[PDB]
Design a protein around this ligand. Structure first.
Ligand SMILES: *[B]([O])([O])[C]([C][C]([C])[C])[N]C(=O)C1=[C]N([C]2[C][C][C][C][C]2)N=N1
Ligand SMILES: *[B]([O])([O])[C]([C][C]([C])[C])[N]C(=O)C1=[C]N([C]2[C][C][C][C][C]2)N=N1
Lengths: 242, 214, 212, 231, 225, 238, 234, 201, 199
């Protein structure tokens, strides 16, 4: 038994957690996920990996999951691991609503999931979840928000951020193009396309290679929708002329 | 066991010079109906100990099974140690008390007879865990009918011979047959001495019905 | 089905300057019949402690065995014999552990304390206890206690010297109250067993009582 | 259930995993605490000062109750767990003792939890170190420091995290009574100490002061800038 | 890699032997038992000048008649100290009396080898138990193997070998508490790397009739002269 | 390393841990069992490793039931545990079905219990072998042997221990099928004296037990006086 | 090498190294001698002293009125086994109102100490014992080991350099049965003395005695009470 | 049973009777109904003698442990809360205990009433037991916060005495205590029959 | 319900009535109360239909497995012990008396009464609510040494007398004869039952 134990939750000689770092390596090669916060909403733009011609389309999306009435998330890393965490997020949100009869504040939902992730890195002997997430949501305390969390159990709030393939280069572009408090959903969508065009290495951006979701407030209610091919195609056209 | 079904009546026991004798009838009663007229309520435990039981017959059969295995287990070791009558009496007491404490009593009143190291033993154990020793014993209806006669003879002659104890027991069995409605005129007499445990039966008491003509 | 039975019996204890007496009758009963006339209700715990028990004999046999084991366990882990007062403190917690399904036993402890003086402790079934000068427990306890209050405690007497109680006087008084209790209490009779605890050890004495 | 012994003794009498946990603390952000007359000063290196970050979401300085604050160094995810365990402890103590906990009482609870994770099957030790401050029921200032092994000590002034030695070495020669005389003088000692390791000292340093019967009063960019300006 | 309960070729438990090694890195503690009582002295071993000496607790009270000095991994000692305090109070509740020094030491020792894969390893600490009961002043010593023994004079910690030599050359059956207190401080100063003042050491005594008493700064200075 | 665990098969399909446990049995002293017409006789060459030990110490002949005897070889502590398992199995059978457990069924139960310690890394295989002898009017004489792997078979004659091969040759010369317990006891004693080594393992005590028609189905130690004749006869033979 | 870390691993020669290593613990402990006559059972242990100022580590323990024990090896394990034995004895008196026969108690120790030699992650008890007792079959001397095996002996010695104590007992065992209590204890002290190096001797500070017999409860003699037994020994 | 306590200008007075009964039989006249937890803390007992004796002794154990762990001495408010949480776990199981916890801590003289249902109240004066209504009448009629120590002792003795005269379950002797800043002092132990005859004259 | 079993030299005869009742209503007038536990072992059911059916199935299962493990036909005593064990263990919950009768090569024809957890071997047994009315009849009519034909006649008569008097009994009479040769079933219909004093 001791001879086969891989010892996933122990400190290495230089105080590092190897399994957590190795899981971060996996997230770095996965599809690009970017989140941008604007004055009138938030958006999620993710590169699609499933692009084969014989693939069928019948779900809400591929990398964007609705968590509750006012929150959505995007994942990067192990697909099957993401399904487990996304289902857990939904339960946490519903449990909060059952108890207080109010939608769970965005940051509280992220923190609850990060607690589960941290637990895997400290005890149990299991390998950690190889997922990084981006959260977009609206709540009555802070309005429109954007969060990013990783396998170690750490999370942070952002105005614009990126995870996955070439996220370091995507973050650089965002720093020089994002205008604090002067961004709009239309202007955020253009930036997303611009950033996505650079990080991705396939010349023509293509509407079939991406998925975009926006979160806005309409008549006192949150509206989350995935942009259709037409709208996405038009956005790509704009960049060409841009 | 809160509701006893088939029950046995009185069990008698008296010490004598060099042994103990116990008697019990062979009736298994179902309420007032005399359902089983040929069941033994006396069991040999080992070479020096015998056991008589009144009350729920199924509980007695279960106790006989458990006790019997214990003795077999001990004999397998072949180490020179065996359960004395006193030790069995103590074990039974703990067993009954334990069951009573969980509100699931073994509905039996028992009489333990034994002979070890030149000493005769006679113990009583009821379903509540009440236990003690005495020169003569009688469970159930015998306490009111047999015990008085037994005690009366022991008040004049404390040490009885085997023959005297045997005759005294037969006199008690007759009285029980005359006055106990759940009794039957077919009984067994078990004796334990230095030679071991012997069980005579079935026996019957001679009955007189002269008073009916009067 | 009832898990208890009233088995009768009376226990008395008296503490003197350098002695304690624990006495009891030897009749064991149930209902209106007598199970045996030779069942003393006082057991030796150590060389300077005796306990007297009365009540349901099933619980009396089990509690005595439990106390006897706790004294051995205490000796093994403390390397000394339990004193009279530690036995009293420990018995209280054992009786209170069955606070919802109580031992139906009235206990009285008689012995010497650490300064070699008589000590008596009386208990109710659920563990409450205190040190007393003398105490009656069991079936005839309400007949005996008032007489001990007057003749040992000197209550309700004026112009009376409160002299210390000697062993000799204490012995005659113990025999007299039990003789009076056997006349009136139906559960008390057969024989009286008296244990005297002093620094020289425990001596026993037996006296006959009415058999009816 | 995973019951493997993770923290065991090494041949020299050391606990390897505990020493590895201490290595993780060394890579953490520098935190500096200093005792004052009637206010405690806590200075933490903000480090991550990105322009796309929501600063409020990643605070190192936290509140444990209405009277006790704390700073940590090392694994940030481990820290969040310990902080929340202490919060529950403070709530429990107010419902069974009818009084707020003292600074040492919460430090003891936290230190005891850390020690428990160095002697338990199936788990590694927490990879953090904490600086706990505040004031007791009466009104005296306290500064405690717990580490991964579970040992805690009271200090006059202390530092933890990366380059803790350097800030500790410099703290001995600069800690006095005149230096911690006034409230605005307690903010001067900290900053200098932080400046010995914090790159571009100024907007890379977070600040917080705990006063008497006053809540977690975090300082602001311009508030801290004043002191930086003069210095 | 072996398990925590692995025996070595010479018949020793590796982990227990490694735990004893840890005791050697700890501060020196001295215990002396005389006819008038027991005294416990421990070197505080303060690492820095900014550290508050009062926060360091190497000597603690288990009960009114029993004191305890620790050495080795101080964090592990707290678990045992609390256990000991609970034992004596439980004993008081049940038997209406005080627990003897030997009994308390026995109870604390029974938790030493209780580890496997619940403690995952043995405690890395050594304890000195001093107090007064019916047998008078008593000094007991317990180590990581669960072994406890009564001693007249004992030193534990980093400089225990040196301290022991001095102790056995200057200890006699008639020596009073004053001599013990002075003698123990003399040896502490000789094996202490730093200078021995009234803020860098800990001292406590327990005599017949008096409770566990931790010497104050003023009382140490007087004796230190 | 393919031989560190019982849950690991080696490349040629072997469980080396089970085979290592069999080596322990081969280091032990010889014990033989002979089944005749009237019953079963057990004989063990109990080595006396010290003069300080009392006679009858570390016996290798057990009573697992009224009618069942057990002869063991190998690790005595492992064997004692197996004897307790067998006793409990016999007692359990009497409670559930109301009669003496048949030997074959008892041998099956114990063997499967033994077999359970050869599949995992969590436990190690038992280091002993044992024989089970019994006699009843209905079943007649029965003799079974179970080894560390859990395989059990019925035998006419069996031997376990270091000199199991030499003892087997001696056993094959006898015509036990038509023999009776009384005359077989002497033969068993004789064989043990022949296979006993003098150069090594000096000083041994002969243990004898039997069960059959002569003991009314009760397994017991052969009466001292009957063992005297056997010991005498065996000494003269060799 | 690869076969000496776990108790569940059989080596290629058919041995279990961990159990052998546990036997080493008993061999390094101070010697203890146990012998008996037709009426008594005696336990004699050489109390070792860690320091010159510390008390001599106890070796003889009371288990019950008719049973006493001596330990050699790990003290922690000894206490655990002694506690178990004490509980078994208490159970016997509570259930059957009689003392537990010595042989049956030794059997219980055997099965309990065997369990951990077959389970992964467990270790063998690292203690050897000498059990003295008196019951219906007379006085007894039993010896237990870390491998869960036990022996019934006329006399025995365990601990460091006990081979010479055993050598001594072997030649004087013939006159043990007829021997009276006083001379029986002498034979015990003489055998125990053999294990000591030439310079050292048996005093009242390093020799503890335990005795049980026909009409005597197990009693432990230490310090000044052992004087009588020592005085008059050539 | 009658117990009482009140705060006044010089601390807290605590007084009790000493009778225990079983039905109509008086089992004792010398029961001690005041437990001394520590030198600045007292507990009174009323209700079932075994419940009161056991739970108040368990509080004393917890109070002592608190002192060894914290090095500070538990406050009256935390001691009463500890007792009220202890007995609240057995609510509905027929425990019978009505206690007064009294002491002097950092916030001055403290007096709390705690009972088996979990009720815990801080107050200036309380009475518990079957004779408590009679004690209240006399205590409230003669109580002033500015009483002198001797006057407070007299009021305590009169309130217990008149309760024992009217209540069949109260009697024996009165044990009185005086809680002060430096700790409690046992004032006296007077037989109520001597007292009532001296008031009758 | 009325059940009866008789031992004869070489086998057993077991029989019963066919009435299942719920108060005053007859829920099943042709129920078979004779259930086989094994090839040569049968059991008669009385008391609660659900309890008896559940017990019989549990036992049949346990005996089947036992028989395949021991590689031989189960003894009648073993079947009775298995039934006794279940009946005694659940005496508080079960209200059904499973009377056991069968044949084996060791003891021949055996009849066992196992009511309430108590096991008793008898030459003949009677059970159910209707058995109370035939106690006198069987005590005066039973003779040792009866043949199977006589046993079948004896059983039929007793059951018929009980069916006429007991409200809970009636319908037809099921009869099974067990020997070494096998099991023989037989049904005596309402118009073929023995007639006695009726008016
Ligand atoms: B008081 O009357 O409330 C008094 C206070 C106690 C001694 C602290 N209580 C009792 O007198 C008393 C009565 N009982 C039981 C009541 C039921 C019958 C057995 C006695 N317990 N305490
Ligand atoms: B007999 O009367 O005892 C008979 C024997 C059974 C079949 C073993 N029992 C019943 O008559 C009987 C009827 N019921 C239920 C009554 C309620 C409806 C379902 C059937 N249970 N036993």
């Amino acid at each position: 038994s001791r001879r086969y134990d891989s010892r996933t939750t122990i400190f290495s000689p230089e105080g590092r957690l190897y399994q957590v770092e190795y899981a971060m390596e996996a997230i770095g090669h996965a599809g690009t996920c970017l989140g941008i916060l604007a004055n009138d909403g938030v958006l999620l733009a993710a590169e699609r990996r499933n692009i084969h011609k014989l693939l069928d389309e019948v779900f809400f999306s591929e990398k964007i999951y609705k968590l509750n009435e006012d929150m959505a998330c995007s994942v990067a890393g192990i697909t099957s691991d993401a399904n487990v965490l996304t289902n857990e997020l939904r339960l946490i949100a519903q449990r909060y609503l059952l108890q207080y009869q109010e939608p769970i504040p965005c940051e509280q939902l992220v923190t609850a999931l990060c607690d589960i992730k941290q637990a895997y890195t400290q005890f149990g002997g299991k390998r950690p979840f190889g997922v990084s997430l981006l959260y977009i949501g609206w709540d009555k305390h802070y309005g429109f928000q954007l969060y990013q969390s990783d396998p170690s159990g750490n999370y942070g709030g952002w105005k614009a951020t990126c995870i996955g393939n070439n996220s370091a280069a995507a973050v650089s572009m965002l720093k020089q193009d994002y205008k604090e408090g002067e961004m709009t959903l239309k202007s955020a969508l253009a930036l997303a396309i611009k950033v996505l065009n650079k990080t991705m290495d396939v010349s023509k951006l293509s509407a079939e290679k991406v998925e975009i979701a926006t979160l806005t407030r309409e008549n006192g209610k949150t509206v989350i929708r995935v942009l259709k091919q037409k709208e996405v195609e038009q956005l790509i056209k704009n960049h060409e002329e841009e | 066991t809160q509701n006893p079904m088939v029950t046995g009546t009185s069990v008698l026991g008296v010490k004598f010079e060099g042994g103990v004798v116990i008697a019990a009838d062979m009736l298994g009663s179902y309420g007032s109906l005399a359902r089983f007229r040929n069941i033994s309520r006396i069991m040999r435990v080992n070479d020096s100990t015998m056991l008589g039981a009144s009350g729920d017959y199924a509980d007695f059969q279960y106790l006989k099974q458990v006790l019997g295995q214990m003795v077999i287990d001990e004999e397998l070791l072949g180490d020179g140690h065996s359960y004395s009558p006193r030790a069995i009496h103590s074990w039974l007491t703990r067993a009954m008390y334990s069951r009573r404490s969980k509100m699931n009593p073994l509905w039996n009143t028992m009489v333990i007879g034994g002979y070890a190291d030149g000493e005769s033993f006679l113990g009583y154990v009821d379903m509540l865990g009440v236990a003690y020793e005495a020169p003569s014993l009688a469970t159930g209806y015998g306490a009111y009918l047999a015990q008085p006669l037994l005690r009366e003879v022991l008040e004049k002659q404390p040490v009885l011979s085997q023959t005297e104890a045997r005759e005294l027991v037969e006199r008690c069995m007759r009285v029980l047959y005359y006055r106990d409605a759940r009794s039957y005129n077919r009984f067994q007499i078990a004796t334990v001495t230095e030679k071991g445990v012997e069980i005579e039966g079935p026996l019957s008491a001679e009955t007189n019905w002269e008073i009916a003509h009067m | 089905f009832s898990p208890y039975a009233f088995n009768g019996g009376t226990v008395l204890a008296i503490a003197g300057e350098d002695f304690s007496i624990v006495a009891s009758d030897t009749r064991l009963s149930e209902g209106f019949s007598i199970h045996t006339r030779d069942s003393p209700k006082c057991y030796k715990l150590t060389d300077k402690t005796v306990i007297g028990c009365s009540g349901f004999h099933g619980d009396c046999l089990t509690l005595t065995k439990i106390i006897e084991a706790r004294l051995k366990m205490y000796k093994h882990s403390n390397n000394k014999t339990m004193t009279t007062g530690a036995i009293a403190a420990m018995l209280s917690t054992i009786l209170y552990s069955r606070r919802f399904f109580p031992y139906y036993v009235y206990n009285i402890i008689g012995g010497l304390d650490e300064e070699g003086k008589g000590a008596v402790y009386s208990f109710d079934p659920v563990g409450s206890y205190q040190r007393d000068s003398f105490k009656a427990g069991g079936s005839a306890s309400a007949m005996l206690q008032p007489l001990l209050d007057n003749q040992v405690g000197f209550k309700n007497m004026q112009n009376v010297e409160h002299v210390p109680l000697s062993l000799d006087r204490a012995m005659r008084l113990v025999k007299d109250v039990f003789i009076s209790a056997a006349e009136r209490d139906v559960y008390t009779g057969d024989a009286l067993r008296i244990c005297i605890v002093t620094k020289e050890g425990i001596r026993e004495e037996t006296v006959p009582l009415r058999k009816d | 259930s995973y019951d493997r012994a993770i923290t065991v003794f090494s041949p020299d009498g050391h606990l390897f995993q505990v020493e590895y946990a201490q290595e993780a603390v060394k890579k953490g952000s520098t935190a500096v605490g200093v005792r004052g007359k009637d206010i405690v000063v806590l200075g933490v290196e903000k480090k991550s000062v990105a322009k796309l970050q929501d600063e409020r979401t990643v605070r190192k300085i936290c509140a444990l109750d209405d009277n006790v604050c704390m700073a940590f160094a090392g694994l940030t995810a481990d820290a969040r767990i310990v902080i929340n365990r202490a919060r529950v402890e403070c709530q429990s103590h107010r419902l069974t003792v009818e009084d707020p906990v003292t600074v040492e009482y919460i430090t003891r609870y936290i230190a005891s939890l850390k020690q428990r994770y160095t002697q338990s099957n199936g788990r590694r030790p927490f990879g953090i170190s904490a600086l706990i401050v505040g004031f007791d029921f009466d009104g005296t200032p306290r500064l405690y420091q717990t580490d991964p092994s579970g040992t805690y000590h009271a200090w006059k002034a202390n530092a933890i995290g990366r380059g803790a030695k350097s800030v500790r070495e410099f703290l001995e020669k600069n800690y006095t009574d005149e230096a911690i005389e006034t409230d605005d003088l307690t903010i001067k000692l900290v900053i200098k100490a932080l400046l010995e390791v914090v790159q571009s000292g100024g907007k890379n340093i977070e600040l917080a002061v705990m006063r008497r019967d006053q809540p977690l009063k975090i300082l602001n960019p311009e508030e801290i800038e004043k002191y930086v300006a003069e210095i | 890699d072996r398990g925590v309960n692995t025996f070595s070729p010479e018949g020793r438990l590796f982990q227990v032997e490694y735990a004893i090694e840890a005791i050697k890195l700890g501060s020196t503690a001295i215990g002396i038992q005389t006819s008038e009582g027991v005294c416990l002295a421990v070197e505080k071993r303060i690492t820095s000048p900014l550290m508050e000496p009062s926060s360091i607790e190497k000597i603690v009270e288990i009960d009114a008649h029993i004191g305890c000095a620790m050495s080795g991994l101080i964090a592990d000692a707290k678990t045992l100290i609390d256990k000991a305090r609970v034992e004596t109070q439980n004993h008081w509740f049940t038997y209406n009396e005080t627990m003897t020094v030997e009994s308390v030491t026995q109870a604390v020792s029974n938790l030493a080898l209780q580890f496997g894969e619940a403690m995952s390893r043995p405690f890395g600490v050594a304890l000195l138990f001093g107090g007064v009961d019916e047998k008078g002043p008593q000094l007991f010593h317990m180590d990581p193997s669960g072994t406890f023994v009564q001693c007249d004079a004992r030193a534990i910690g980093s400089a225990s070998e040196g301290a022991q030599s001095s102790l056995q050359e200057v200890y006699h059956k008639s020596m009073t508490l004053k001599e013990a207190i002075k003698s123990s401080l003399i040896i502490l100063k000789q094996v202490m790397e730093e200078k021995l003042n009234a803020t860098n050491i800990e001292l406590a005594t327990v005599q017949p009739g008096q409770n566990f008493h931790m010497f104050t700064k003023e009382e140490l200075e007087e004796v230190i002269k | 390393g393919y031989d560190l665990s019982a849950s690991t098969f080696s490349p040629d399909g072997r469980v080396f841990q089970v085979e290592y446990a069999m080596k322990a049995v081969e280091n032990s002293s010889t014990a033989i069992g002979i089944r005749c017409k009237d019953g079963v006789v057990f004989g063990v060459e109990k080595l006396v490793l010290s003069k300080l030990y009392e006679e009858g110490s570390n016996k290798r002949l057990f009573n697992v039931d009224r009618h069942v005897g057990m002869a063991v070889a190998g690790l005595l502590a492992d064997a004692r545990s197996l004897a307790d398992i067998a006793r409990e199995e016999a007692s359990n059978f009497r409670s559930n079905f109301g009669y003496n457990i048949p030997l074959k069924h008892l041998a099956d139960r114990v063997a499967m219990y033994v077999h359970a310690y050869t599949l995992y890394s969590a436990v190690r295989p038992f280091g002993c072998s044992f024989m089970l002898g019994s006699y009843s009017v209905n079943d007649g004489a029965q003799l079974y042997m179970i080894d560390p792997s859990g395989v059990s078979y019925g035998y006419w004659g069996c031997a376990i221990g270091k000199a199991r091969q030499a003892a087997k040759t001696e056993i094959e010369k006898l015509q036990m099928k038509e023999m009776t317990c009384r005359d077989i006891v002497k033969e068993v004693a004789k064989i043990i004296y022949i296979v006993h080594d003098e150069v090594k393992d000096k000083a041994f005590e002969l243990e004898l037990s039997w069960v059959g028609e002569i003991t009314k189905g009760r397994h017991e130690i052969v009466p001292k006086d009957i063992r005297e004749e056997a010991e005498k006869y065996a000494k003269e033979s060799l | 090498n690869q076969y000496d870390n776990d108790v569940t691993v059989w080596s290629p020669q058919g041995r279990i190294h961990q159990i052998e290593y546990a036997m080493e613990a008993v061999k390094q402990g101070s010697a203890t001698v146990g012998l008996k006559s037709k009426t008594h059972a005696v336990l004699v242990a050489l109390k070792r002293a860690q320091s010159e100022l510390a008390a001599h580590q106890k070796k003889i323990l009371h288990v019950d009125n008719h049973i006493g024990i001596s330990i050699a090896g790990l003290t922690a394990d000894a206490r655990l086994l002694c506690n178990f034995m004490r509980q078994e004895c208490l159970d016997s008196r509570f259930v059957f109102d009689r003392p537990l026969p010595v042989s049956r108690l030794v059997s219980l120790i055997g099965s309990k100490t065997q369990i951990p030699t077959q389970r992964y992650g467990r270790r063998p008890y690292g203690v050897g014992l000498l059990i003295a007792g008196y019951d219906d079959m007379g006085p007894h001397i039993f010896q237990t080991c870390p491998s869960a095996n036990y022996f019934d002996c006329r006399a025995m010695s365990i601990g460091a350099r006990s081979q010479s104590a055993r050598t001594y007992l072997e030649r004087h065992m013939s006159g043990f049965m007829e021997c009276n209590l006083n001379e029986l204890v002498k034979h015990g002290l003489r055998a125990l003395r053999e294990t000591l190096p030439a310079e050292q001797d048996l005093t009242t500070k390093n020799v503890s005695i335990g005795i049980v017999g026909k009409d005597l409860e197990f009693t432990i003699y230490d310090d000044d009470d052992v004087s009588p037994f020592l005085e008059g020994l050539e | 049973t009658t117990t009482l306590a009140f705060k006044f200008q010089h601390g807290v007075i605590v007084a009790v009777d000493s009778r225990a009964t079983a039905g109509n039989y008086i089992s004792s006249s010398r029961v001690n109904k005041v437990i001394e937890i520590n030198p600045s803390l007292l507990g009174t007992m009323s209700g079932c003698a075994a419940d009161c004796q056991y739970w108040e002794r368990l509080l004393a154990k917890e109070c002592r442990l608190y002192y060894l762990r914290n090095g500070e001495r538990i406050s009256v408010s935390a001691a009463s809360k500890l007792l009220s949480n202890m007995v609240y776990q057995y609510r509905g199981m027929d425990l019978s205990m009505g206690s007064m916890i009294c002491g002097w801590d950092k916030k001055g003289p403290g007096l709390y009433y705690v009972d088996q249902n979990g009720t815990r109240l801080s107050g200036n004066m309380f009475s518990t037991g079957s004779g408590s209504t009679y004690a209240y009448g006399v205590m409230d009629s003669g109580y002033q916060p500015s009483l002198s120590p001797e006057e407070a002792y007299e009021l305590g003795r009169r309130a217990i005495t008149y309760a024992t005269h009217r209540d069949s379950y109260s009697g024996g002797i009165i044990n009185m205590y005086h809680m002060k800043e430096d700790g409690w002092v046992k004032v006296e132990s007077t037989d109520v029959n001597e007292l009532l005859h001296q008031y009758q004259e | 319900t009325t059940i009866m079993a008789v031992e004869f030299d070489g086998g057993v005869v077991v029989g019963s009535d066919s009435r299942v009742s719920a108060g005053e209503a007859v829920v099943n007038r042709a129920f078979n109360k004779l259930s086989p536990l094994h090839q040569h072992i049968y059991c008669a059911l009385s008391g609660s239909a659900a309890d008896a059916q559940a017990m019989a199935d549990m036992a049949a299962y346990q005996l089947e497995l036992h028989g395949l493990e021991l590689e031989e036909p189960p003894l009648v005593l073993a079947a009775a012990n298995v039934v006794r064990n279940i009946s005694y263990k659940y005496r508080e919950d079960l209200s059904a008396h499973l009377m056991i009768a069968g044949w084996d090569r060791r003891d021949g024809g055996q009849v066992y009464g196992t009511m309430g957890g108590m096991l008793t071997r008898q030459p003949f047994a009677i059970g159910g609510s209707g058995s109370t009315y035939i106690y006198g009849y069987v005590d005066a009519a039973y003779k040792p040494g009866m043949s199977p034909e006589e046993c079948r006649s004896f059983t039929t008569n007793a059951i018929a007398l009980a069916m006429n008097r007991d409200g809970s009994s009636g319908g037809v009479i099921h009869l099974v004869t067990i020997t070494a040769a096998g099991v023989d079933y037989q049904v005596i219909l309402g118009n073929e039952l023995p007639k006695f004093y009726d008016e």
